[PDB]
Design a protein around this ligand. Structure first.
Ligand SMILES: Nc1ncnc2c1ncn2[C@@H]1O[C@H](COP(=O)(O)OP(=O)(O)OP(=O)(O)O)[C@@H](O)[C@H]1O
Ligand SMILES: [Mg+2]
Length: 126
């Protein structure tokens, strides 16, 4: 199992930051923690690296698990975040943008992410 850390990021319009990976799936931004890095710090770094968005962690969410196409089981720890700015897709792109809850429900490719989206929306203050 390999750890992961990501963020469910929201802007003022309460839109969520989504990315389209190599295999064509829309997901939340996340990546591998660096040695000595906490998951929260790792999550903030991964968001900035992959989208150029500077975000603030509001509170922790919960981890999701799954086995990727390479046979590696991943445990990704998530954090609710706040951020702004036009996303800048990284050279591992194909897609990115801010989406409303309803649009995100139609893009997110996995059950774990759809579930995570709702729980995040509920804890996101007004
Ligand atoms: N919740 C999920 N359930 C099932 N499959 C998923 C889930 N999330 C992602 N995947 C699949 O696994 C892939 C992502 O795996 P993973 O996060 O390990 O790789 P990565 O982020 O592309 O690269 P890396 O982790 O090596 O830096 C997706 O491209 C997709 O095919
Ligand atoms: Mg990384």
């Amino acid at each position: 199992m390999e750890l992961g850390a990501g963020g469910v990021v929201f802007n003022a319009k309460r839109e969520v930051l989504l990315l389209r990976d190599r295999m064509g799936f829309w997901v939340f931004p996340k990546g591998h923690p660096e040695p000595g890095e906490s998951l929260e710090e790792a999550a903030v770094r991964e968001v900035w690296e992959q989208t150029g968005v500077r975000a603030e962690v509001l509170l922790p969410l919960y981890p999701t698990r799954y086995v990727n196409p390479k046979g590696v089981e991943r445990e990704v720890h998530w954090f609710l975040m706040r951020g702004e700015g036009a996303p800048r897709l990284e050279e591992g792109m194909t897609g990115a943008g801010w989406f409303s809850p309803e649009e995100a429900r139609a893009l997110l490719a996995f059950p774990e992410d759809l579930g995570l989206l709702e729980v995040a929306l509920e804890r996101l203050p007004l």
